Amino acid sequence: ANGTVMSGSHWGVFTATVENGRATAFTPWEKDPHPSPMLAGVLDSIYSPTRIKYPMVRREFLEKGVNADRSTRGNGDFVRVSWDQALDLVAAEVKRVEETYGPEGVFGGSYGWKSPGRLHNCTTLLRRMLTLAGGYVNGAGDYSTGAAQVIMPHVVGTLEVYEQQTAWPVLAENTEVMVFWAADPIKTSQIGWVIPEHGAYPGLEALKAKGTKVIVIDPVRTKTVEFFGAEHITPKPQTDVAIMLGMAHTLVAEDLYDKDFIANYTSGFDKFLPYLDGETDSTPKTAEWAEGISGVPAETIKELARLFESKRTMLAAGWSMQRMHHGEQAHWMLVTLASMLGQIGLPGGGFGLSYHYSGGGTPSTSGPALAGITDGGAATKGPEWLAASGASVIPVARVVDMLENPGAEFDFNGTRSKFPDVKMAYWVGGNPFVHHQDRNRMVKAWEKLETFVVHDFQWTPTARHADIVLPATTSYERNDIETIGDYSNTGILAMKKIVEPLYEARSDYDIFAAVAERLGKGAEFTEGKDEMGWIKSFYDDAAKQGKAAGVEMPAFDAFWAEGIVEFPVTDGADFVRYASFREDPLLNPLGTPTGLIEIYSKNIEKMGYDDCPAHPTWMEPLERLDGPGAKYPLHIAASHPFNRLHSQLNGTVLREGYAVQGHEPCLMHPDDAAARGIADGDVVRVHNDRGQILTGVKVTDAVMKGVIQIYEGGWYDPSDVTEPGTLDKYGDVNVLSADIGTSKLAQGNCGQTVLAEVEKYTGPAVTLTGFVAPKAAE
Ligand SMILES: NC1=NC(=O)C2=N[C@H]3C(S)=C(S)[C@@H](COP(=O)(O)OP(=O)(O)OC[C@H]4O[C@@H](n5cnc6c(=O)[nH]c(N)nc65)[C@H](O)[C@@H]4O)O[C@H]3NC2=N1
Ligand SMILES: NC1=NC(=O)C2=N[C@H]3C(S)=C(S)[C@@H](COP(=O)(O)OP(=O)(O)OC[C@H]4O[C@@H](n5cnc6c(=O)[nH]c(N)nc65)[C@H](O)[C@@H]4O)O[C@H]3NC2=N1
User: Fold this and answer.
1) Beta partners for 394?
2) What domains can you pick out in the chain, each with its CATH number?
3) Is any atom of ligand 1 closer than 6 Å to the C-beta of 7?
């Protein structure tokens, strides 16, 4: 096999060079305006030393089954087995758990970023098989906008976080002041949930070319700051709401805010005002009060408030500030501040919660939607699940609380239910042993599972902790179809097979059709179709919709031969979010009970949640930098990796470009380094009451004083899985996070509410074992 093949991924469209059946180079699509350097690691992930070769069974589970000693999961003691033995065993375990415990005994939430592709959607495929097996417990929401996606529907009446933004070109022509609040779009625009078009880069470039004022509010001097030479505001992490309240207070005290916009488009500001003024608690939320909490100068806070009120301003907020205790307050208070500015719905004004994600704001084309295989759920009646058997769904980040407290009650967005009693967890396309908070608690809670099954193509910590590991193929070893552009709908791509499945790896589709076949539902899982039958069915449906919309597309074979279809932009570049509501709120009301922006929410008031009041409120978090009585001195900006997609690509050649002494890097301010005797490049121990990890320090004033940056996604590498609190040799920041809910409203994760201490490491030397396969899988 010596040629070139085009395909796509979460990092973008690309062309692979193949030489005697091996992919040797991934070259970015010629129309990608800003490719990601991570493509080199994508290619490397097909072949790296942590590629999973064969199906494996954890020796203790192979020998003892449910009586296994579960405290040794993760020690790497696996036995290689044949595909037939492993499929029989997985099918027997699914049947056994379903029969013995009901669907409530099987957790199938399997949260994860997987790979794009309408056919090879491993998490949907898992659920298609589990539906056929009798059912399963699902997850609700995600780790990205756990809080924001639940509070927005109460406030603005829509999901908001995953909806199209005012178009980039409308911003270049109308916005005078662009604010990136807790957003680093240069960093996070590299990837897409579906194939990315990188539409933010030309949008950002156009703002810079127009000379538009840009202000970044972030504890770290990011590349977004650098790109624009932006005015950079450095709040102590977790104090943005106090700053917003200080700005709002200033707008009232100086009599500047838009009273008309508040009277005509919002509901409940009159119940928020007294609190803002301090009438209810003797604590006027002044700029000075906000300086006390956040560290940002009171005069800067007022000057920003005045600037935003006097110029067409776009508040482009990111999501790290809601992935925290009381996370709901952040975007609720931002919308409240934006309502006080009165520019929601005007070209270039208001707010936007997706300018830093998957091309939000890239103009949408007139093309049709593309849909892929489904879980079969809307197809034969799932039996009756009664409340006594527990909820059939949990907020995703409550997975460990669930395992630890079967039958216990939990509150979620106005409803109380009981946790189901789960005995089996099946995970594909996700890495919970890296993405979930409080690794030491989670490691212990996993002992409640009888059986844990994982499919991946990389030996992640999650694969290392499974009882049964099945090697999946990458997208580059099969064919698929997918949209380019979560919002732009730039076109549809043929994700063409580049190389044959490596080693004994199999698509998740093939695996699940095999398990389903052993359960007696083979035909039902495949629907009588094969890989191209499924792909052509999705395409044809897309084509039928396009033909009916005046966007006719070629026949399938013709589309597949070209490898792509691109669609025309009609009016998508003119899109202004909230314009129709602004233009006539009686004709175009929002989906809230009042039809208006709810600054005070009667529906939330009725829930009676102490941690989620009925108007945006400054509440003390579990821990925050310089909080009164806080134990630990440094805030960890546990944010998204520049050179990984979460944990993805950790076990590739890219790792050498950022690792420090082989460990995940930790940014630290020179003053904080010097106070601990720490030198740039030193191995340091980062620890709190929940865990301890090793990182390699990079001393830089890019991180504000009091804050260290350790990205999420590091492959957890425990020194000894049987030792509680064991040191993590590589640097998974989730060993240090707490596992608590943003509040009772959303139950989102608080992965960025983290305080810790750092010292030069003086323990025993460490050997990294997470970047090579377990000995028996070699
Ligand atoms: N402290 C902290 N701060 C954060 O900001 C933070 N972010 C959170 C968020 S928003 C997210 S979404 C999570 C990410 O958590 P997530 O589990 O989504 O992370 P990934 O590293 O994308 O794991 C995806 C896995 O799927 C595997 N895979 C890819 N394609 C396939 C396939 O076709 N088949 C199979 N079987 N496997 C496949 C990949 O190899 C990889 O191991 O981390 C969350 N955790 C976080 N913690
Ligand atoms: N390169 C890359 N890697 C990825 O893993 C990745 N993941 C994707 C996913 S699923 C999503 S959800 C998004 C995540 O998009 P999200 O906006 O949640 O990104 P983060 O990197 O967690 O935080 C963005 C910025 O917030 C700053 N910040 C942290 N705490 C605070 C705070 O208290 N106040 C303020 N004002 N700023 C704070 C951080 O320093 C960081 O620069 O990116 C997506 N894109 C991604 N790109």
Assistant:
1) 139
2) 2-29+479-496+527-567 (3.90.55.10), 51-142+375-478+504-526 (3.40.50.740), 144-363+576-601 (3.40.228.10), 609-771 (2.40.40.20)
3) no
